Scaffold this active site. Structure first.
Site, PDB file in Angstrom:
ATOM      1  N   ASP A  14      71.605  45.963 -99.994  1.00  0.00           N
ATOM      2  CA  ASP A  14      72.469  45.803 -98.844  1.00  0.00           C
ATOM      3  C   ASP A  14      71.708  45.359 -97.605  1.00  0.00           C
ATOM      4  OD1 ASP A  14      75.008  45.848 -97.543  1.00  0.00           O
ATOM      5  OD2 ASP A  14      74.515  47.823 -96.687  1.00  0.00           O
TER       6      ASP A  14
ATOM      7  N   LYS B  81      68.822  62.309 -90.149  1.00  0.00           N
ATOM      8  CA  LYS B  81      69.942  62.082 -91.055  1.00  0.00           C
ATOM      9  C   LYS B  81      70.189  63.399 -91.757  1.00  0.00           C
ATOM     10  CE  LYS B  81      71.665  59.276 -94.846  1.00  0.00           C
ATOM     11  NZ  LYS B  81      71.442  58.174 -95.844  1.00  0.00           N
TER      12      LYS B  81
ATOM     13  N   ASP C 276      68.392  51.609 -93.701  1.00  0.00           N
ATOM     14  CA  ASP C 276      69.535  51.567 -94.597  1.00  0.00           C
ATOM     15  C   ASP C 276      70.550  52.652 -94.234  1.00  0.00           C
ATOM     16  OD1 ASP C 276      71.332  51.809 -96.733  1.00  0.00           O
ATOM     17  OD2 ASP C 276      69.853  51.034 -98.157  1.00  0.00           O
TER      18      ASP C 276
ATOM     19  N   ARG D  68      73.091  44.356 -89.845  1.00  0.00           N
ATOM     20  CA  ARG D  68      73.495  45.689 -89.411  1.00  0.00           C
ATOM     21  C   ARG D  68      72.477  46.742 -89.873  1.00  0.00           C
ATOM     22  NH1 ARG D  68      75.984  46.200 -94.663  1.00  0.00           N
ATOM     23  NH2 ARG D  68      77.178  44.261 -94.291  1.00  0.00           N
ATOM     24  N   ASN D  69      71.577  46.369 -90.777  1.00  0.00           N
ATOM     25  CA  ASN D  69      70.570  47.298 -91.279  1.00  0.00           C
ATOM     26  C   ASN D  69      69.144  46.981 -90.830  1.00  0.00           C
ATOM     27  OD1 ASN D  69      71.881  49.373 -92.834  1.00  0.00           O
ATOM     28  ND2 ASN D  69      72.515  47.752 -94.262  1.00  0.00           N
TER      29      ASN D  69
END
Ligand SMILES: O=C(Nc1cncnc1)c1c(Cl)ccc2c(Nc3cccc(C(F)(F)F)c3)noc12
Length: 288
Positions: A157, A47, A175, A161-162
């Site tokens: 969250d 990242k 995340d 999707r995480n």
């Protein structure tokens, strides 16, 4: 941000990484090859920020990294392998790589490969998803949340999707419209607490047992949605759910935050549900 950064433990040489195809964008995540990142060649996810981004984003990426260093290691939380922070190149945070991607899509793709359970000749259900898999993924995500909860963390969250999927059905919490996952207090008072994440874990549960489905199908996410959520309206049972499981979904969606189970109670409960399914599955397999 207040947390210290032990460079002697996490620092990785930039030229020891060969960056590959990108994964997601929002900074941006990339697949890559790391040489000697662990005790010879390994695949990883990096990242990194862009060129000239806001000093803030740098600060943010750093604090995200320190948080991961703070949380520690757990099998069910994406693993931090390293980071390039010293001057010379852009700031990069390196984690393990999960080949199968986010859980929602993975599930979404196995809808033609599902059977409640297997029996002889079980070679007809090769690479098939079953209830055990679904409950297993739910068990693991719960353990990872009990972990995170135990460290004063709050996802904010938590959704399918995480959730990343690795080799041998091991899922990991990572995340990268969110209203659909938020609890009533979180939407109306803007309050994020461990309990509100349990609300979300409930939305996650529904996603899993609906094999990647989108929550609150056909509903527009406007004011009326928010009102019904607040008045007690809830989703119906998904297509691959069991009765006990759906009920757990309901408990997580309790209006009164204190009345929602906890991640420890959830681990305790899914573990049992998994053990029972296992037993039934043993009897199903034995007779036929
Ligand atoms: O998405 C990431 N990695 C990754 C792994 N496998 C497939 N695709 C992407 C990732 C990368 Cl490359 C760097 C940092 C974090 C990350 N950090 C994080 C920050 C706050 C809380 C948490 C969590 F503990 F709550 F998960 C994780 N989650 O996911 C990542």
């Amino acid at each position: 941000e207040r947390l210290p950064y032990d460079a002697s433990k996490w620092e990785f040489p930039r030229d020891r990484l060969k960056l590959g195809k990108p994964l997601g964008r929002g900074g941006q995540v990339i697949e890559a090859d790391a040489f000697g990142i662990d005790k010879t060649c390994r695949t990883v996810a990096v990242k990194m920020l862009k060129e000239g981004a806001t000093h803030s984003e740098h600060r943010a990426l750093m604090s995200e990294l320190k948080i991961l260093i703070h949380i520690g290691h757990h099998l069910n939380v994406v693993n931090l392998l390293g980071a390039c922070t010293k001057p010379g190149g852009p700031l990069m945070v390196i984690t393990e790589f999960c080949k199968f991607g986010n859980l929602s899509t993975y599930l979404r793709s196995k809808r033609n490969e599902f059977v409640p359970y297997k029996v002889a000749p079980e070679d007809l259900y090769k690479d098939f998803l079953t209830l055990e898999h679904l409950i297993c993924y739910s068990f693991q995500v719960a353990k990872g949340m009990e972990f995170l909860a135990s460290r004063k963390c709050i996802h904010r969250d938590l959704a399918a999707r995480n959730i990343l999927l690795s080799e041998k059905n091991v899922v990991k919490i990572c995340d990268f419209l969110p209203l659909k996952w938020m609890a009533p207090e979180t939407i109306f008072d803007r309050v994020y607490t461990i309990q509100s994440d349990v609300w979300s874990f409930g939305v996650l549960l529904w996603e899993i047992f609906s094999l990647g489905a989108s929550p609150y199908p056909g509903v527009k996410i406007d004011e009326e949605f928010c009102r019904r959520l607040k008045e007690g309206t809830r989703m119906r049972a998904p297509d691959y759910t069991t009765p006990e499981m759906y009920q757990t979904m309901l408990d997580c969606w309790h209006g009164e935050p204190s009345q929602r189970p906890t991640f420890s109670e959830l681990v305790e409960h899914l573990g049992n549900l998994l053990q029972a399914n296992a037993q039934q599955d043993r009897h199903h397999h034995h007779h036929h």
